[PDB]
Nucleic acid binder design. Structure first.
Ligand SMILES: [Mg+2]
Ligand SMILES: [Mg+2]
Lengths: 114, 1206, 115
RNA sequence: AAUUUCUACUAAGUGUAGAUGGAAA
């Protein structure tokens, strides 16, 4: 009796995550290179409410250049510098600087980070 | 010395600086804990209540005193009115009896039955408490004990009500001009039809119900007008006419209804009575405005009933007296001639032809002054009958029938709109948005109110102002309907002021701080009673208000050098010495000051004032009494440095008082220890607001405002007496008008776009937040300090005469000339004393200059954008107040560009004169905004001042020029004001400036007779082959109405091309067009003068098209309405050299010697007229200069414009 | 049942509208004022997919300032010029003049309106 | 799109350029 309801949740949560990444692509594009936050880039849509930070897979680096895709309008991201050739489609900012993620930084604190 | 340096220090001029007061330190918490706001917010919220109560008491007083009035002159006025005056110098005594009548009604008003304890402080203190029987209504008026000074304006307006100034806001004018008129009118209307109403149907009933004493005849009989002055009087009069209610649902029928039903005869048309007048919307909530709209315009409300009654009354336009319905002369005839006849100026022309056949002789041409007198006689005409308007037309075209058709058309328009608006009139309607943002709801309100109002404005013309026999059978019903229809004005002005009203609000109330005399002045001795001082620390000026109970809290404070010391501003000025010194020295203090009888007896006579030739010893005797008494009266000797002049300087008494007032201003600085006053703040004993505005804040670097400069100079050392602090400050509080759920903010570090397209830098990344209306979303105290610039003026003299004397004796006077335009909002050209153009440009691009860089804000592309914005807004009610608030924030940045030239050139200014001109409907700055410009350029030249100048130098903020008189009224803008010459603007833009040509013909087609007479009125029509031109040698003597010109012998050509309007547009070439026209009909145009050849063709297709090209030859004003880049004026007449004037040959020059556009020509020829006036000043003698006329009439002007260029 | 899904898909439509407005408000905030597209405004969400352009209660004007609210950050817009105070929360760019609305402009065109 | 307040702004970053006579009816 749950034929498509799951396919409704999987679209609502993805649209919410896309709105989040579009609200974050600006707050990243307007910062000096040395004040970016620490991202948990995954190239799979990530949630900011929980994010399941206990998973040993989510990394922690400062974000690089945030580039607006040209085929569609997706806000892709680079990590570190352009010499890593790392390019991601989904990120989340955390105050877990090195590899231990204490907390996920909220939007008003990645704005205030300037 | 320039012409200006003479004009300073002329007269006194008071302004009102404002500021924001920021509560400093712990004063905000104290104002909140002692509760000094909700008290003063409750007062100025219930003050409307005491206004209601005082109006109630005034009405009770008036109705209690008009039961004792007696108009004794009435028994003679009643007979003097119906004399058939036929004035013959006999109605002047009528006017005098009427004046004495309205006065003897205001004798008891002005003199007796109180009127003393009515407008003083007593009424709210002691009188009104008696006059009440409620406790609620007594609590209000008891709370205002001592705060009477919060009324004085109201009481001011309530003296207009008891006087007889012949104004709508008076009692006598109400009960004389609008009662006695209708009283006698209805009395005679009854005398006509007295024996119609038989006894047993109206009299036996109207006796028992109304009064049953002096029943029905006495109210029409005799002088019973001395009974219909109260409110019960006029109520019983309308009970005679309109009827009673008999306190139930009976509603017996009244006299007017009896005349109505007496249409049993079906040929009644009988004149119905008229009532008597009597003395004494929304804008709150969207639902209220919608409810008021529905209740005042739905198909049941009185306005729609009146529209129905007018539709009926004008459907029967045949069965009325076609010699008794009077259209009103004025603006309405201009359009009535377009509706009825078919042209814009048919009626005026028929009337001019008739007046010609009466007053004018059979002279071969009119005379300019004769035509002016004819225009004047037309303007004096009051009204027109429908009979006359029938005479001005031919046969087979009625005038009553055409008007009936037109009015029926307008009423069908209103009905169609009401049909397209039925959705809004349903009782079960609801809104999806707020009315201010909703537009499919405001568009409907506007489409309905514009229909009703443009019906009411086209009907009003049927009044004609006071006449001979009229058609009472028409005007009874007409006035009864129209006086109801007139309320659409109230509705349309109180719904537009709610759909336009901005989202915030500046609604404030006044803070008193538990004290009636708060801040009423700054005096040293009276601090403990006013409780307000102005401390100053560094470069920041603090207000300081003590409290209720610690008035002695700012005295025991010494300097003590603790590295913090507030300064403090003191030494009160002198109040009104001309009455003060007589008061301060003759207040019965002669007991133990002096011994002499000589001074006392000349005091008894009072022989020290005027009323005699003059005396050297008596005047200075009292002068020396005052002098040697102030120099020994210690209260003033120690305070002011009374350094009077010598004895031989005095020549009158006024000099002494002016000197005493000039010397009594010593705003001085005392010191005070900073920690003591700060602790006073912290103890809750001193409220220290800081005066502030964005030019005091430390992060501001540019030029300060003007008023900030005045407020800083109030306390300078080089400000001796020029800008002084006239007492009477105030402190208001503004609550926040924006919910903090409604701020919008350009977020921090987000690149913003720049609205100015002429700005190079096209972004902005600010590192903070830029809120929108941040100032309206917070409680803000504001402070109003009045100042009085040039209080004691020295150089007193009349200016209209001194400017003239200064112009006569000057050899090379420049003249700025300012005129509007079609492609330029305001064109300026400044011409020197000979006629040369020394500078000319447009004010469209205001170039703002700051910090050495200049950025040019356009103001034409911006207004063009807002017009394109208004074009597609569907409601045009807040989108046409934006343009009206831009065009009036543009003529405040033109005023600086004019007060820059007036100082750079010492010029006079030549402005258009708006009482006598008709600018052609496509000029950008319309008249309603120009009048706002000429009134904003006078209020600036009153005290012209340059912000970027040394504040002492002539021109700077302390010694600014005063080159114009104060602004009196919009109709007192004529023929002179200081440096501002108002010159009329006829024959100013369509007049070529190389020669002085102008086009005085009439080149429209009428027939073949007129056209042949035209082509025969020339002297030569010859094709010169060497120039490929068609020389038309004309002499202005043959044609008509050309008495204005001077040369009268012109050689027109066909040079250049023209731009036919066709709204299409087509560029035609004149020589080629003439060749084609002459070939199309086979006219050998190589036989020199082809005049006789031209009068051969006999069709209507030739002279209908030849007149077209002949008109295109005399145009000189070619426009395209599509490009500002190609507009030009060209003249068809060679000048003294041989070349034509082609304004396209000067657009490509840096500083030409002739007008470049066709708008620089307008302002150039507006400045030349003032050069001609200056010319006139160089003739008369300095005693006659006050009499030289300036209104340069067209003949003089054309002469001056055609002789100057040789 | 099947009348709860149709009370939840109308909550995917709104999270699509918000994403669309946030994509727009960062593509209008950059164009210089003389190039901002003609928009159809409304205070209730406007689906730029279907929009039933034939409805007679939606006009088309320019779009002035694109500001951003204070408490939340909902991107309010400003139709016409600011001083009209016509603040509307949801717009959708069309290609029609004042009332003869032709078609809904797609985001690629609004983006290529700057060049 | 910040203001004693109005208009035009962003004008080199909590502001720039002009104007501004308030209270009252
Ligand atoms: Mg400034
Ligand atoms: Mg503004």
């Amino acid at each position: 009796m749950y034929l498509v309801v799951q396919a409704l949740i999987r679209a609502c949560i993805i649209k919410e995550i896309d709105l989040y990444t579009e609200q974050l692509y600006n707050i990243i594009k307007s910062l000096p290179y040395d004040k970016r936050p620490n991202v948990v880039y995954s190239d799979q849509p990530l949630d900011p409410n929980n994010l399941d930070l206990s998973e040993p897979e989510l990394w922690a680096e400062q974000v690089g250049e945030c580039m607006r895709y040209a085929h569609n309008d997706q806000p892709c991201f680079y990590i570190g510098s352009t010499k890593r050739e790392l390019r991601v489609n989904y990120i989340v900012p955390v105050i877990g600087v090195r590899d231990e993620i204490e907390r996920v930084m909220t939007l008003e604190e990645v704005r205030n980070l300037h | 010395m320039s012409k200006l340096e003479k004009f300073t220090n002329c007269y006194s001029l008071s302004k009102t600086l404002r500021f924001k007061a920021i509560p400093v330190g712990k004063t905000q918490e104290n104002i909140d804990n002692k509760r000094l706001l909700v008290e003063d917010e409750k007062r100025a919220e219930d003050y409307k209540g005491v206004k209601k109560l005082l109006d109630r008491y005034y009405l009770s007083f008036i109705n209690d005193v008009l039961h004792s009035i007696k108009l004794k002159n009435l028994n003679n006025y009643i007979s003097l009115f119906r004399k058939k005056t036929r004035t013959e110098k006999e109605n002047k005594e009528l006017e005098n009896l009427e004046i004495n009548l309205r006065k003897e009604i205001a004798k008891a008003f002005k003199g007796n039955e109180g009127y003393k304890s009515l407008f003083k402080k007593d009424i709210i203190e002691t009188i009104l408490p008696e006059f009440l029987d409620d406790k609620d209504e007594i609590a209000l008026v008891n709370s205002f004990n001592g705060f009477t000074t919060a009324f004085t304006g109201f009481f001011d307006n309530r003296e207009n009500m008891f006087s007889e100034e012949a104004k709508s806001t008076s009692i006598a004018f109400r009960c004389i001009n609008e009662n006695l008129t209708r009283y006698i009118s209805n009395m005679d209307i009854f005398e006509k039809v007295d024996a119609i109403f038989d006894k047993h149907e109206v009299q036996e009933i109207k006796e028992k119900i109304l009064n049953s004493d002096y029943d029905v005849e006495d109210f029409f009989e005799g002088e019973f007008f001395n009974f219909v002055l109260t409110q019960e009087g006029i109520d019983v009069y309308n009970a005679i006419i309109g009827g009673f209610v008999t306190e139930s649902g009976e509603k017996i029928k009244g006299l007017n209804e009896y005349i109505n039903l007496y249409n049993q005869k079906t040929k009644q048309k009988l004149p119905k009575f008229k009532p008597l007048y009597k003395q004494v919307e929304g804008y709150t909530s969207d639902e209220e405005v919608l409810e008021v709209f529905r209740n005042t315009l739905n198909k049941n409300s009185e306005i729609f009933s009146s529209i129905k009654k007018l539709e009926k009354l004008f459907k029967n336009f045949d069965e009325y007296s076609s010699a008794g319905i009077f259209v009103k002369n004025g603006p309405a005839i201009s359009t009535i001639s377009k509706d009825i006849f078919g042209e814009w100026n048919v009626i005026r022309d028929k009337w001019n032809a008739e007046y010609d056949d009466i007053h004018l002789k059979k002279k071969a041409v009119v005379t300019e002054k004769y035509e002016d007198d004819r225009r004047k006689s037309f303007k004096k005409i009051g009204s027109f009958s429908l009979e006359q308007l029938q005479e001005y037309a031919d046969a087979d075209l009625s005038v009553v029938e055409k008007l009936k058709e037109i009015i029926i058309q307008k009423v069908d328009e209103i009905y169609k709109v009401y049909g397209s608006s039925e959705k809004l009139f349903d009782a079960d309607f609801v809104l999806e948005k707020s009315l201010k943002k909703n537009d499919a709801v405001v568009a409907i309100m506007k489409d309905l109110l514009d229909s009703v109002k443009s019906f009411e404005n086209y009907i009003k013309a049927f009044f004609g102002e006071k006449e001979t026999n009229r058609d009472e059978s028409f005007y009874g019903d007409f006035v009864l309907a129209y006086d109801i229809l007139l309320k659409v004005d109230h509705i349309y002005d109180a719904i537009r002021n709610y759909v336009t009203q901005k989202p915030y609000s500046k609604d404030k109330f006044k803070l008193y701080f538990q004290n009636p005399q708060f801040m009423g002045g700054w005096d040293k001795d009276k601090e403990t009673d006013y409780r307000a001082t102005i401390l100053r620390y560094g470069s920041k000026y603090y207000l300081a208000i003590m409290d209720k109970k610690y008035a002695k809290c700012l005295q025991k404070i010494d300097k003590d050098d603790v590295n913090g010391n507030y300064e403090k501003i003191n030494y009160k000025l002198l109040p009104g010495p001309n009455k003060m010194l007589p008061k301060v020295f003759f207040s019965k203090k002669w007991m133990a000051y002096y011994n002499s009888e000589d001074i006392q007896k000349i005091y008894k006579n009072g022989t020290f004032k005027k009323g005699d030739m003059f005396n050297l010893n008596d005047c200075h005797k009292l002068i020396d009494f005052f002098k040697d008494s102030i120099s020994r009266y210690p209260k003033w000797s120690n305070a002011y440095d009374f350094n009077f002049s010598e004895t031989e300087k005095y020549k009158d008494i006024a000099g002494f008082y002016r000197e005493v007032e000039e010397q009594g201003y010593k705003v001085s600085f005392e010191s005070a220890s900073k920690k003591e006053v700060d602790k006073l703040v912290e103890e809750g004993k001193l409220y220290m607001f800081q005066i502030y505005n964005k030019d005091f804040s430390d992060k501001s670097h540019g030029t300060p405002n003007l008023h900030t400069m005045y407020f800083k100079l109030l306390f300078d050392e080089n400000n001796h007496g020029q800008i002084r602090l006239s007492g009477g400050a105030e402190l208001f509080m503004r609550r926040a008008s924006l919910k903090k759920e409604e701020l919008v903010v350009h977020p921090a570090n987000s690149p913003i776009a720049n609205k100015n397209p002429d700005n190079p830098k096209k972004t902005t990344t600010l590192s903070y937040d830029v809120y929108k209306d941040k100032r309206f979303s917070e409680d803000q105290y504001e402070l109003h300090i009045p100042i009085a610039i040039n209080k004691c003026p020295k150089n007193i003299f009349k200016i209209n005469t001194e400017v003239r004397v200064l112009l006569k004796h000057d050899d090379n006077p420049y003249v700025i000339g300012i005129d509007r335009g079609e492609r330029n909002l305001l064109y300026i050209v400044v011409v020197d004393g000979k006629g040369n153009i020394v500078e000319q440009y447009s004010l469209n691009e205001i170039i703002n200059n700051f910090n050495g860089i200049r950025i040019k804000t356009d103001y034409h592309s911006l207004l063009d954008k807002k017009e394109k914005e208004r074009f597609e807004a569907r409601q045009n009610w807040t989108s046409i107040e934006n343009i009206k608030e831009l065009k009036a924030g543009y003529i405040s940045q033109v005023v600086h560009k004019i007060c820059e030239l007036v100082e750079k050139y010492d010029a006079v200014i030549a402005l258009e004169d708006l009482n006598s001109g008709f600018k052609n409907s496509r000029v950008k700055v319309e008249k309603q905004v120009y009048q706002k410009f000429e009134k904003m350029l006078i209020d600036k030249l009153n005290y012209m001042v340059d912000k970027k100048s040394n504040p002492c130098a002539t021109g700077g903020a302390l010694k600014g020029y005063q080159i114009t008189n104060k602004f009196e009224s919009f109709k007192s803008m004529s023929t002179q004001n200081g440096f501002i010459f108002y010159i009329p603007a006829w024959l100013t833009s369509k007049i070529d400036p190389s020669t002085g040509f102008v086009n005085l013909l009439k080149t429209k087609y009428t027939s073949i007779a007129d056209s042949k007479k035209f082509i025969s009125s020339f002297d030569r029509i010859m094709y010169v082959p060497e120039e490929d031109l068609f020389e038309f040698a004309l002499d202005y003597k043959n044609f008509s109405r050309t008495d204005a010109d001077y040369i009268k012998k012109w050689k027109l050509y066909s040079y250049g091309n023209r731009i036919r309007i066709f709204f299409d547009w087509e560029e035609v070439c004149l020589t080629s067009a003439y060749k084609e026209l002459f070939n199309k009909y086979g006219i050998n145009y190589q036989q020199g003068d082809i005049r006789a050849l031209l009068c051969e063709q006999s069709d209507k297709a030739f002279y209908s098209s030849f007149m077209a090209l002949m008109s295109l030859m005399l145009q000189m004003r070619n426009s395209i309405t599509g490009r500002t880049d190609v507009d030009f004026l060209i003249s068809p007449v060679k000048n003294s050299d041989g070349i034509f004037y082609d304004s396209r040959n000067y657009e490509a020059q840096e500083n030409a010697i002739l007008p470049k556009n066709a708008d620089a020509n307008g302002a150039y020829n507006i400045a030349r007229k003032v050069l001609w006036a200056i010319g006139q000043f160089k003739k008369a003698e300095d005693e006659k200069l006050d009499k030289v006329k300036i209104a340069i009439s067209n003949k003089e002007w054309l002469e001056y414009a055609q002789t100057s260029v040789k």
